[PDB]
Amino acid sequence: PQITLWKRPLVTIRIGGQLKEALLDTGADDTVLEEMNLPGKWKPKMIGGIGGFIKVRQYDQIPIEICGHKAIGTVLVGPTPVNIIGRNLLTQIGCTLNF
């Protein structure tokens, strides 16, 4: 599909039983999800944006479905105000910027 940017590019994602709305975000290197209790091993990390840094949990090889497209990779979980689909998964579902 083609998504215009008049509004926030929010789409439905699925990670486990949870359907969530997430931002398709070309400005995010990594995928950052709102706090959720995922199973598995993880590593601590700090990621920075406007306002400063937040502490997140890095989970690897987590399957996620983004608008019916399958992806699998690293997901960062922490106190973000919005679910963010970053470039690590955007490439997997074939997402490009066009103008």
Ligand X SMILES: CC[C@H](C)CN(C[C@@H](O)[C@H](Cc1ccccc1)NC(=O)O[C@H]1CO[C@H]2OCC[C@H]21)S(=O)(=O)c1ccc(OC)cc1
Between CA 71 and CA 90 the distance in angstroms is 9
**Residue 5-44 contact track with a second copy, rule CB under 8 A, x = bound:** xx-xx-------------xxxxxxx--x------------
Element housing 88 (H / E)? helix 87-90
Q: Taking the complex as a whole, how short is the minimal distance between the CB of residue 68 and a second copy, in angstroms? A: 10
CA angle 78, 83, 23 (to 5 degrees): 150
Q: Is-contact 74 59, C-beta < 8 A?
A: yes
Q: Which does 24 bind (CB under 5 to 8 A by kind): ligand X, a second copy, none?
A: a second copy
List of residues contacting a second copy (CB under 8 A): 1-6, 8-9, 23-29, 32, 47-54, 67, 69, 79-82, 84, 87, 90-91, 93-99
